[PDB]
Amino acid sequence: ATYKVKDVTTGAEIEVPDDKYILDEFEKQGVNLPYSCRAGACSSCVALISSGEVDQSDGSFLSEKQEKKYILTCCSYPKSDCTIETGYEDKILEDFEIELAETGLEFFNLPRSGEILSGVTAPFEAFDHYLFGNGVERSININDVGFNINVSQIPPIMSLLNGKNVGRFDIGSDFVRNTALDGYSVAAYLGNITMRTEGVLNVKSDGTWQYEGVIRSYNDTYDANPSTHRGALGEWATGVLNNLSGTPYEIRIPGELKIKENGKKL
Ligand code: FES
Ligand SMILES: [Cl-]
Description:
It contains 7 helices and 15 strands. The chain has helices at about 20-30, 65, 95-110, 120-130, 155-160, 185-190, 235-240, and strands spanning about 1-5, 15, 45-50, 55, 70, 75-80, 80-85, 115, 140, 165-180, 190-205, 210-215, 220, 250, 255-265. The strands form 4 sheets. It has a 5-stranded mixed sheet, with helices on one face. The radius of gyration is 28 Å and the shape is rod-shaped. It starts with a strand and ends with a strand. The relative contact order is 0.12. FE2/S2 (inorganic) cluster (FES) binds next to loops.
């Protein structure tokens, strides 16, 4: 039989006999491709295979898991129509990194889009999205993050409560939230964010006070590259980033958190 082998890199579509190697037949039709050994023992001729199947049993360089994703074009016979991407030598991954992507898809899943699942997996999902999400925006409602914000932690409010100010004050101010205050799980994907509180603070002459309002969040940019933030990644995440490049992305945090507190200054 013969099969059609479409190559996304060059655009060529070549009929390749099931008893001829893909490289040789593309060359025969005038499409020059990369190679070195031509003997199955290197990655010069490697191509991504996105659809179809080959017999590349003549080659030796790729692992069993790598052969699910890539082909050595010098020693591959097509067994069905195929879609490949030549010149992929610069982009092939080793087993531990192919399986990291697969696992994340299956564990968290359109995939790697929209809402982030609330709870203990959030910083894991966020890191996986950094690695494999290609910069697509994600979201989590402010009420699903697990913020634990109190007035003592909001300097625009405390500035009025700490001075001798009596009356009714309309507060509308941004402030930086170090989400370490909200727990390691949140800090591990949000870090420092900018938030906004809007509300009313009422302070009596005797020091009794009440605050009522809302808190909203501006969008945050997720970027795990260590030079862009405060946190230790740890040895495992450092390792992953020594082998894969991620893509920053925006996290949209919509909604209002209600805040209502009261006290008495002495
Ligand atoms: S050119 Fe070395 S494996 Fe194909
Ligand atoms: Cl004062």
